[PDB]
Design an enzyme around this catalytic site. Structure first.
Site, PDB file in Angstrom:
ATOM      1  N   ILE A  28     -32.777  63.280  49.808  1.00  0.00           N
ATOM      2  CA  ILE A  28     -34.291  62.944  49.404  1.00  0.00           C
ATOM      3  C   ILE A  28     -35.237  63.083  50.456  1.00  0.00           C
ATOM      4  O   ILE A  28     -36.327  62.993  49.937  1.00  0.00           O
ATOM      5  CB  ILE A  28     -33.958  61.373  49.149  1.00  0.00           C
ATOM      6  CG1 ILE A  28     -33.454  60.566  49.977  1.00  0.00           C
ATOM      7  CG2 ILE A  28     -32.891  61.127  47.651  1.00  0.00           C
ATOM      8  CD1 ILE A  28     -33.714  59.040  49.974  1.00  0.00           C
ATOM      9  N   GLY A  29     -34.858  62.976  51.611  1.00  0.00           N
ATOM     10  CA  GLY A  29     -35.914  63.059  52.575  1.00  0.00           C
ATOM     11  C   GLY A  29     -35.514  63.936  53.846  1.00  0.00           C
ATOM     12  O   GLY A  29     -34.277  64.169  54.078  1.00  0.00           O
ATOM     13  N   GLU A  30     -36.679  64.066  54.820  1.00  0.00           N
ATOM     14  CA  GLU A  30     -36.236  64.855  55.985  1.00  0.00           C
ATOM     15  C   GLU A  30     -37.089  64.257  57.073  1.00  0.00           C
ATOM     16  O   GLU A  30     -38.275  64.111  56.859  1.00  0.00           O
ATOM     17  CB  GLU A  30     -36.636  66.519  55.961  1.00  0.00           C
ATOM     18  CG  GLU A  30     -35.940  67.404  56.830  1.00  0.00           C
ATOM     19  CD  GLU A  30     -36.004  68.734  56.564  1.00  0.00           C
ATOM     20  OE1 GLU A  30     -37.142  69.146  55.735  1.00  0.00           O
ATOM     21  OE2 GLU A  30     -35.369  69.413  57.148  1.00  0.00           O
ATOM     22  N   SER A  32     -37.805  63.360  61.439  1.00  0.00           N
ATOM     23  CA  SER A  32     -37.869  63.997  62.772  1.00  0.00           C
ATOM     24  C   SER A  32     -36.650  64.414  63.453  1.00  0.00           C
ATOM     25  O   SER A  32     -36.485  65.225  64.262  1.00  0.00           O
ATOM     26  CB  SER A  32     -38.727  63.190  63.657  1.00  0.00           C
ATOM     27  OG  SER A  32     -38.432  61.813  63.933  1.00  0.00           O
ATOM     28  N   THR A  33     -35.614  63.549  63.054  1.00  0.00           N
ATOM     29  CA  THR A  33     -34.069  63.671  63.998  1.00  0.00           C
ATOM     30  C   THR A  33     -33.059  64.122  62.692  1.00  0.00           C
ATOM     31  O   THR A  33     -32.165  64.474  63.230  1.00  0.00           O
ATOM     32  CB  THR A  33     -33.981  62.275  64.361  1.00  0.00           C
ATOM     33  OG1 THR A  33     -33.782  61.155  63.411  1.00  0.00           O
ATOM     34  CG2 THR A  33     -34.896  61.868  65.569  1.00  0.00           C
ATOM     35  N   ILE A  35     -31.884  64.386  58.119  1.00  0.00           N
ATOM     36  CA  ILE A  35     -32.264  64.458  56.830  1.00  0.00           C
ATOM     37  C   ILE A  35     -31.572  63.251  56.373  1.00  0.00           C
ATOM     38  O   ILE A  35     -30.737  62.405  57.053  1.00  0.00           O
ATOM     39  CB  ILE A  35     -31.618  65.486  55.958  1.00  0.00           C
ATOM     40  CG1 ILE A  35     -30.296  65.718  55.734  1.00  0.00           C
ATOM     41  CG2 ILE A  35     -32.352  66.917  56.470  1.00  0.00           C
ATOM     42  CD1 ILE A  35     -29.712  66.635  54.894  1.00  0.00           C
ATOM     43  N   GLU A  97     -28.853  50.689  53.839  1.00  0.00           N
ATOM     44  CA  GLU A  97     -29.220  50.272  52.495  1.00  0.00           C
ATOM     45  C   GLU A  97     -30.255  51.396  51.947  1.00  0.00           C
ATOM     46  O   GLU A  97     -30.963  51.934  52.697  1.00  0.00           O
ATOM     47  CB  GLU A  97     -30.169  48.960  52.929  1.00  0.00           C
ATOM     48  CG  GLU A  97     -31.084  48.397  51.863  1.00  0.00           C
ATOM     49  CD  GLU A  97     -31.947  47.389  52.453  1.00  0.00           C
ATOM     50  OE1 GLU A  97     -31.807  47.033  53.491  1.00  0.00           O
ATOM     51  OE2 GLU A  97     -32.446  46.587  51.535  1.00  0.00           O
ATOM     52  N   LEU A  99     -33.691  51.942  50.084  1.00  0.00           N
ATOM     53  CA  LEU A  99     -34.631  51.520  49.638  1.00  0.00           C
ATOM     54  C   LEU A  99     -35.615  52.313  48.799  1.00  0.00           C
ATOM     55  O   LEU A  99     -35.955  53.147  48.894  1.00  0.00           O
ATOM     56  CB  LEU A  99     -35.726  51.536  51.183  1.00  0.00           C
ATOM     57  CG  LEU A  99     -35.545  50.419  52.249  1.00  0.00           C
ATOM     58  CD1 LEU A  99     -36.215  48.884  51.796  1.00  0.00           C
ATOM     59  CD2 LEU A  99     -34.048  50.076  52.216  1.00  0.00           C
ATOM     60  N   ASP A 141     -42.703  54.361  66.648  1.00  0.00           N
ATOM     61  CA  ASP A 141     -43.199  55.307  65.669  1.00  0.00           C
ATOM     62  C   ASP A 141     -43.723  54.675  64.344  1.00  0.00           C
ATOM     63  O   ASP A 141     -43.243  55.171  63.493  1.00  0.00           O
ATOM     64  CB  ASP A 141     -42.051  56.446  65.666  1.00  0.00           C
ATOM     65  CG  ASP A 141     -42.296  57.778  65.062  1.00  0.00           C
ATOM     66  OD1 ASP A 141     -43.741  58.119  65.242  1.00  0.00           O
ATOM     67  OD2 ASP A 141     -41.712  58.499  64.383  1.00  0.00           O
TER      68      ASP A 141
END
Ligand SMILES: O=S(=O)(c1cccc2cnccc12)N1CCCNCC1
EC number: 2.7.11.1
Length: 290
Positions: A28-30, A32-33, A35, A97, A99, A141
Site C-alpha cells: 500500500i505504501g513506499e 524512505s526506509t 515499503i 496497527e 491506520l 521527520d
C-alpha cells in the site's frame, strides 16, 4: 558487514516469521526506509500493517534500531502501535496497527481543510510531541506523510526511523536528517539542535494543510535548503485564507531562533487549538468519503 548486522538485529527482534500467521500481503505504501503492506491475520480476519525494510538499502543502517527502541519504550495514544518485529531474510519487518484512513498527505493534496480540522490535527500531533520531547525523543521527520489517520478520524504519529534521543549527557543532536522542505534552519545550518526542530517542521506542515504544499516545493531539494537556511521564515501563499488566530499560532512555530520558538507544552495552551473539532470532523476529508 551485512551478515554482521543481520546477526545483531536478530538479538533484539522477536523470534520467528510473521508469514506463519499472516495472509494476503498487499503493498500500500513506499517510505524512505522501505515499503508498507496490509496483511490479514489468518486466525482473526483482522488487518495489520507490515513495514518491510531492506538492510542493504539504508543510508544509515544503524537507524533501523529506532524502530525497536520506540516499540519498546514510547507507546502512546497519538502514536502508531507497534506489535512485533522480525528478521526475515535480509529484511526487518515490523508488524503494526493498520491506520485505514491513510496519511494526511492524501488529504492536503486533494482537499481544503477548514480550521476546525487543522486545529484537530495540530492538537493531536502536539499532544504526542509534548510527551515525546519530555522524554528526550526528537522525531526529526514531521510532515503530512508521517501523520496517519484511523477510519474515524483519530490522528497518530508514525515513521520514527529517523528519530534520536537527547539527555543530560547528550543535550543536542548534530545529524543531517529529515526531509529537505520540512527541515529547520538550525539543522540545515549544521548547528547542534534539540526538540525545537520538530516544532519548525510542524509549522511547515500547517502550511501544507493550508496551501497544499510546503514552501519552495517546486525548487530542487538542495536549493530549497539553501533558501530555508538564508531567508526569512517562509510565508503563506494567501494570508487572507487564515484566521488571525491561526496566523498567530503559525508565528510561534516558524521562528528562526530555536530559543524563541514555542515548545510543544506551551503550544498546547494556544487559543487557536480551542477551535479543535472532534476526530469525527476529519472523517469527511478521507478518500473513501469525499
Ligand atoms: O500510509 S503509509 O502507507 C503507512 C506507513 C506506516 C504505517 C501505516 C499503517 N497503516 C496504513 C499506512 C501506513 N505511508 C507510506 C510511507 C511513506 N509515505 C506515507 C506513509
Amino acid at each position: 558487514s551485512h551478515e554482521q548486522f543481520r546477526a545483531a538485529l536478530q538479538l533484539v527482534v522477536d523470534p520467528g516469521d510473521p508469514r506463519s500467521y499472516l495472509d494476503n500481503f498487499i503493498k500500500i505504501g513506499e517510505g524512505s526506509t522501505g515499503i508498507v503492506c496490509i496483511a490479514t491475520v489468518r486466525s482473526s480476519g483482522k488487518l495489520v500493517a507490515v513495514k518491510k525494510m531492506d538492510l542493504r538499502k539504508q543510508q544509515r543502517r544503524e537507524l533501523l534500531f529506532n524502530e525497536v527502541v520506540i516499540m519498546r519504550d514510547y507507546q502512546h495514544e497519538n502514536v502508531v502501535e507497534m506489535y512485533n518485529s522480525y528478521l526475515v531474510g535480509d529484511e526487518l519487518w515490523v508488524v503494526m496497527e493498520f491506520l485505514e484512513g491513510g496519511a494526511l498527505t492524501d488529504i492536503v493534496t486533494h482537499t481544503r481543510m477548514n480550521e476546525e480540522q487543522i486545529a484537530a490535527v495540530c492538537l493531536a500531533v502536539l499532544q504526542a510531541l509534548s510527551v515525546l520531547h519530555a522524554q528526550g525523543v526528537i522525531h526529526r521527520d514531521i510532515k503530512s506523510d508521517s501523520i496517519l489517520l484511523t477510519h474515524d478520524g483519530r490522528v497518530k504519529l508514525s515513521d520514527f526511523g529517523f528519530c534520536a534521543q537527547v539527555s543530560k549527557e547528550v543535550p543536542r543532536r548534530k545529524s543531517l536528517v529529515g526531509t529537505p522542505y520540512w527541515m529547520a534552519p538550525e539543522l540545515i545550518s549544521r548547528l547542534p539542535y534539540g526538540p525545537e526542530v520538530d516544532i519548525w517542521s510542524l509549522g511547515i506542515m500547517v502550511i501544507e494543510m493550508v496551501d497544499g504544499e510546503p514552501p519552495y516545493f517546486n525548487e530542487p531539494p538542495l536549493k530549497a535548503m539553501k533558501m530555508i537556511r538564508d531567508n526569512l521564515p517562509p510565508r503563506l501563499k494567501n494570508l487572507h485564507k487564515v484566521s488571525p488566530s491561526l496566523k498567530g499560532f503559525l508565528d510561534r512555530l516558524l521562528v528562526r531562533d530555536p530559543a524563541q520558538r514555542a515548545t510543544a507544552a506551551e503550544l498546547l495552551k494556544h487559543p487557536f487549538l480551542a477551535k479543535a473539532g472532534p476526530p469525527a470532523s476529519i472523517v469527511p476529508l478521507m478518500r473513501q468519503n469525499r
